[PDB]
């Protein structure tokens, strides 16, 4: 039944419009490339294609080299398996990141929607997701979750997710 496991419609339904539209864009990109799963690297690459976001600002305020990050994400994308003839699906890590972003957004910040900065915090607080993230770029080892949780507004500045 619909009540055996948490549904994607409920889980992803907690995303704000920027994050959810970027899941959609990531799916379209993933499919064009023939990659078998929509992954964190597709989602983060699509978020960084926008004019601005929490992720842009967190990169800036954390002292990450955004050009290096862009290089690393492009290279990770180019290395994914291609020519998938299977039906595309979402990576388990993308589902898990939304759950952890909901936990921190709703409990730590008292907020009804998950913005991309809460996705970053939820990832950093989960060892398997943090390992996946740094696997995409060693730049993400520069993130400091204690700073990001205590000084969130300073890190996200004038992000449109405000």
Residue numbers in the entry: -1 to 160
What does the paper say about this structure?
It involves the assembly of a tubular structure composed of TssB and TssC that is similar to the tail sheath of bacteriophages. The AAA+ ATPase ClpV disassembles the contracted sheath, which resets the systems for reassembly of an extended sheath that is ready to fire again. The interaction of TagJ/HsiE with the sheath as well as with ClpV suggests an alternative mode of disassembly in which HsiE recruits the ATPase to the sheath.
In this study, we resolved the crystal structure of the N-terminal domain of Pseudomonas aeruginosa ClpV1 and observed structural alterations in the hydrophobic groove. The asymmetric unit contains two copies of ClpV1-N in nearly identical conformations (r.m.s. deviation for all Cα atoms of 0.5 Å). The overall structure of ClpV1-N is similar to that of the Vibrio ClpV-N, with matching secondary structure elements and an r.m.s. deviation of 1.6 Å for 121 equivalent Cα atoms. Both structures possess an N-terminal helix α0 that distinguishes ClpV-type ATPases from other Hsp100 ATPases (e.g. ClpA). The residues lining the VipB binding groove in ClpV-N are partially conserved in ClpV1-N. For example, Ile10 and Phe87 lie at the bottom of the groove. The two aliphatic residues Leu6 and Ala86, which sit at the top of the groove in Vibrio ClpV-N, are replaced by large residues of opposite charge in ClpV1-N (i.e. Arg6 and Asp87). Both conformations not only diminish the hydrophobic character of the groove but also are incompatible with binding of an α-helix, as observed in V. cholerae.
